[PDB]
């Protein structure tokens, strides 16, 4: 052909990307967006965090700062109370010094430097044939990820049953103790994306057991601490339990949704070892995998959670700033479960309240959500997974009704 | 009960990294580091350009903008500036609208981004075993970032003449002569890493008619565009020469230097291709690609070049700043050369000025490099390489005497 690029095609578009084309497409005045991906106020516009606001003005009066490149690992002092966020200040794993902390852009650079990884060091010589299981619909991007690092079987576990409309916890532990040996177990830490069901601490105690005798390779995927239910503790139990039972793991930690950067890339790869020195051999094969990714980390972002953890008068603010997104969450789901009530829709509907975090699986089949798309143009996945936070006072009036809709016919 | 990291080797550092870290332990107050990999001043302080302190004080004061998430490609503003950059503000390929732009993590994460995508849709698919040529010493990443890749075929070609201390012209020629059809050339585009020695535009005729004949895809690392010569029109004339020849490439962008924005991993990776179409579907293959690598690129670093490239007065101002930088290494050259052929130092010294860029091959031995670093105090790489924007006007009469006892003594 004439063209080097001429045998190559149009990748395909991502399904939620191309709801969010079609709304802005659709003509009609009470069209409702509910699959952004990223939290929105009561007036459909996103909100910069005041906190970051504030720590972004110091930052650009600051002086002392150069450009000059951070280390591969990235900046110091946000790696260290990036991961004192989520395993705590009392954590023994820090008392030990059996933490890493690699600085990453967003999640999804923590989930690609710990699969390459894993695909490298882990269970094996480039064993890339170590099984990787997946929750019942994941993130859509886990597959993709640990796909690109080279495993070659990824599979599923169940999570979310569709008829109770909450967590299936004897499909996930079959499926558990049904892996084979050192299989890498993708969990989410809280927030579970898209179905917003979390494991109850009695639920996760049960999953670990099955990952403990087992050997089990637990890969945390933190992205939304803080976020989702407004407390940093309850948000990080299941981490924090895998460390009192002596678990080793990687933790992808983000910092998009409760600082709101998504623009600038913040995460980092927590990772907790048995001993100090497997953290050191651990961190240095991660700048060698940094080195040919992005050689360093960006630095803005990281500069605003570091000052904004490590100073005692911001992070109350911060905290300020959190709870304010969360309880906004919060109250859009109890507002949405008691007009759904109200108006005697069938079915159960504590979910809308059992879940948390900003995405909710709110339970209908393909073809009722069609109906809210097509008939009442309120746009969500055919996966049945609205964004709570694309809920306004003004538009839940309209979205109970039709959901209620929905269900009566169909 | 053992580790799972237990049998991870512990890595070891950088021989650049080992030779920072073994000068600022040195004792000898006589001790002159030219090892560092970002540029330096007079008194061997990090610089920040005056334009970028300027700009960081526009986004500060600007409530407009947000921190959602920037296109999968980048910022649209950005990628327009930067190719245009390269290419030519009057360029054909733009004009006919057959130009891509990805922005990256730094060129590294350019280079990534495109070597992921040649060993997907290049020469076939999924085609790891196209060779890949590089410099015969060349930035050692290039083999990391390809390798990284998947390509299995990396291959050098001859470029540093150590005898003449010069290019060698047919070594270079006389290499891709031999080499397979449609093999991966990554080239230059100025300021030759770490030589610093270019090819002269008639040079660079019979490089692009090698490959040309020979359907050579060529791979540009243009990383020091305006920071090595100081216009900017001349450190892309390689870039617009393949282009009017009707040559289908990539150039990885760089901004790390002649923005002096290091830590914000600024880059980018243009694509000229023959026909628009094809354009548009390889820039959608490469969204799968980078929201599996990062999710999304950094916004603080972009937006800071894209304001100064879109404001004519930010412009100048960008470019008065780049020409102290390059004035300075043109001077630090200069005077370089004097001292040694004013000391009647044996063999030729008009290499220091031929080079371009803040890296010159010194001409040096490995054991004329020991004595510098032994008995001198001055460090540098086995290689011969030097900083020369690390040489200042009060060590530059001691660098060069070291230099004539070196070869004088070895
Ligand atoms: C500083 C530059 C741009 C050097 C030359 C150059 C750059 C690129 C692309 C890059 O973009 C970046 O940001 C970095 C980067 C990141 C970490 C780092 O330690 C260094 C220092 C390495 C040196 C100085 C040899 C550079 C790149 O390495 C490709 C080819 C090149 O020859
Ligand atoms: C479950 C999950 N994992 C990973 C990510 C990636 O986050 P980021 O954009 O910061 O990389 C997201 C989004 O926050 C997510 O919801």
């Given at each position: 052909?004439?063209?080097?690029?001429?045998?190559?095609?149009?990748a395909q578009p991502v399904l939620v990307f191309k709801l969010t084309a079609d709304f802005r497409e659709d003509p009609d005045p009470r069209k409702v967006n509910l699959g952004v991906g990223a939290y929105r106020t009561d007036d459909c516009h996103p909100w910069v965090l005041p906190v970051v606001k504030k720590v972004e003005q110091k930052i650009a009066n600051d002086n002392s700062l150069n450009h000059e490149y951070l280390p591969i690992?990235?900046?110091?002092?946000?790696?260290?109370?990036?991961?004192?966020?989520?395993?705590?200040?009392?954590?023994?794993?820090?008392?030990?010094?059996?933490?890493?902390?690699?600085?990453?852009?967003?999640?999804?650079?923590?989930?690609?430097?710990?699969?390459?990884?894993?695909?490298?060091?882990?269970?094996?010589?480039?064993?890339?044939?170590?099984?990787?299981?997946?929750?019942?619909?994941?993130?859509?991007?886990?597959?993709?990820?640990?796909?690109?690092?080279?495993?070659?079987?990824?599979?599923?576990?169940?999570?979310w049953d569709a008829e109770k409309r909450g967590l299936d916890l004897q499909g996930f532990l079959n499926?558990?103790?049904?892996?084979?040996?050192?299989?890498?177990?993708?969990?989410?830490?809280?927030?579970?994306?898209?179905?917003?069901?979390?494991?109850?601490?009695?639920?996760?105690?049960?999953?670990?057991?099955?990952?403990?005798?087992?050997?089990?390779?637990?890969?945390?995927?933190?992205?939304?601490?803080?976020?989702?239910?407004?407390?940093?503790?309850?948000?990080?139990?299941?981490?924090?339990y895998f460390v009192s039972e002596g678990f080793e793991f990687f933790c992808a930690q983000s910092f998009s949704k409760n600082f709101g950067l998504y623009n600038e890339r913040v995460g980092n790869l927590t990772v907790v070892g048995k001993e100090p020195e497997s953290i050191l051999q651990v961190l240095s094969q991660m700048e060698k995998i940094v080195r040919i990714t992005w050689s360093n980390p960006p630095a803005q972002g990281a500069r605003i959670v570091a000052s904004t953890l490590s100073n005692p008068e911001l992070?109350?603010?911060?905290?300020?700033?959190?709870?304010?997104?969360?309880?906004?969450?919060?109250?859009?789901?109890?507002?949405?479960?008691?007009?759904?009530?109200?108006?005697?829709?069938?079915?159960?509907?504590?979910?809308?309240?059992?879940?948390?975090?900003?995405?909710?699986?709110?339970?209908?089949?393909?073809?009722?959500?069609?109906?809210?798309?097509?008939?009442?143009?309120?746009?969500?996945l055919p996966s049945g997974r609205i964004n709570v936070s694309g809920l306004t006072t003004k538009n839940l009036d309209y979205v109970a009704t039709s959901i209620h809709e929905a269900v009566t016919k169909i």
């Open positions: 052909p004439p063209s080097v690029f001429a045998e190559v095609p149009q690992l990235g900046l110091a002092e946000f790696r260290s109370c990036a991961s004192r966020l989520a395993l705590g200040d009392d954590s023994p794993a820090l008392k030990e010094k059996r933490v890493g902390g690699v600085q990453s852009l967003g999640g999804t650079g923590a989930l690609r430097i710990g699969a390459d990884f894993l695909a490298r060091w882990y269970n094996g010589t480039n064993n890339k044939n170590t099984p990787v299981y997946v929750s019942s619909p994941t993130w859509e991007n886990h597959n993709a990820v640990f796909s690109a690092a080279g495993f070659k079987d990824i599979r599923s576990y169940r999570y499926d558990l103790e049904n892996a084979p040996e050192f299989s890498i177990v993708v969990l989410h830490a809280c927030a579970h994306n898209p179905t917003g069901i979390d494991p109850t601490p009695e639920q996760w105690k049960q999953i670990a057991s099955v990952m403990k005798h087992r050997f089990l390779f637990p890969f945390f995927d933190s992205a939304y601490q803080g976020f989702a239910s407004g407390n940093l503790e309850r948000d990080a139990w299941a981490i924090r992070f109350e603010e911060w905290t300020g700033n959190v709870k304010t997104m969360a309880d906004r969450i919060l109250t859009m789901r109890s507002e949405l479960r008691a007009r759904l009530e109200a108006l005697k829709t069938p079915g159960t509907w504590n979910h809308i309240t059992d879940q948390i975090g900003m995405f909710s699986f709110t339970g209908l089949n393909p073809k009722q959500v069609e109906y809210l798309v097509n008939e009442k143009h309120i746009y969500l």
